[PDB]
Amino acid sequence: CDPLCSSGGCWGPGPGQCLSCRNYSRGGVCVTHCNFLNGEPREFAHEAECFSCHPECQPMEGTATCNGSGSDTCAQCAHFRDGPHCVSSCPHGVLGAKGPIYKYPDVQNECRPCHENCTQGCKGPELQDCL
Amino acid sequence: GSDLGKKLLEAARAGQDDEVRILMANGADVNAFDHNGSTPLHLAAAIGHLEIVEVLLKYGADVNAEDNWGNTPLHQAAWVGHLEIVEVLLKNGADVNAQDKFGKTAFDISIDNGNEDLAEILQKLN
């Protein structure tokens, strides 16, 4: 049996062949720990299982990169942030509840609304900022 | 393919054509969706990236997928005036008479926005 299997026992000598893990498991394979502080992809744990952080979470050094799988549970957004979600880009007319949503990124890479009358996007909040 | 589906949604969103091609070659879920129900095809249709639209369609994207509001990618393409994307979606089986939450088709949307070319294309193609 692999040393990462619990006191219970195993069905084969491999890490992915234990009946239960001593510490953590990544896709049914026993591991010493998840990619909490180092490694790729960065991970969080739930019930002793390792799950990947959303790819838009900025990988943090010496601290957790996320506490869940959603783009809203990152410690920091790698690129831009739209409301609670880490996104690779601000909306470019993607449909929302009342039609197309256009936003621009601010100095802090936060997505802010375009002016009501912008049809091709914007680079700021004013009407003269349309396009 | 689930981790790659999340990466696929972001690459399609940012119009990263090469990234999408690499992600599809690695088997990313082409019908994955974000918190708005938007699939990679909805996102590609909004930013106007015709080659991303064609790559996703080649890899089996559902041309009639709906977001949280009942919108198909044809609705998204018509709303922002992407005529060539409307033409490619129609060629790959898009339902021309799919209705949104207000009972409107791509044609009604084009008429409501005064896009005469889009309305004409929709009439001639179907």
Residue numbers in the entry:
A (entry chain B): 481 to 611
B (entry chain A): 11 to 136
Study authors write:
HER3 (ErbB3), which had long been neglected, has emerged as a key oncogene, regulating the activity of other receptors and being involved in progression and tumor escape in multiple types of cancer. Designed ankyrin-repeat proteins (DARPins) constitute a class of artificial repeat proteins that were developed as alternatives to antibodies. Here, the selection of DARPins targeting extracellular domain 4 of HER3 (HER3d4) is described. The DARPin D5 epitope comprises HER3d4 residues 568–577.
One of the selected DARPins, D5, in complex with HER3d4 crystallized in two closely related crystal forms that diffracted to 2.3 and 2.0 Å resolution, respectively. In the monoclinic setting the structure comprises two complexes that are related by a twofold noncrystallographic symmetry (NCS) axis running almost parallel to the crystallographic c axis (0.13° tilt between the NCS and unit-cell axes). A comparison of the lattices revealed that the packings are almost identical. The only obvious difference is a small shift between the ab planes relative to each other of less than 1 Å. Indeed, superposition of NCS-related chains within each of the crystal forms P21 and P212121 revealed root-mean-square deviations (r.m.s.d.s) for all atoms of 0.164 Å (1554 atoms) and 0.304 Å (1657 atoms), respectively. The L86Q framework mutation positions the hydrophilic Gln86 side chain between the Val574 and Leu575 side chains, where it forms hydrogen bonds to the HER3d4 main-chain atoms Gly573 O and Leu575 N, thus explaining its selection.
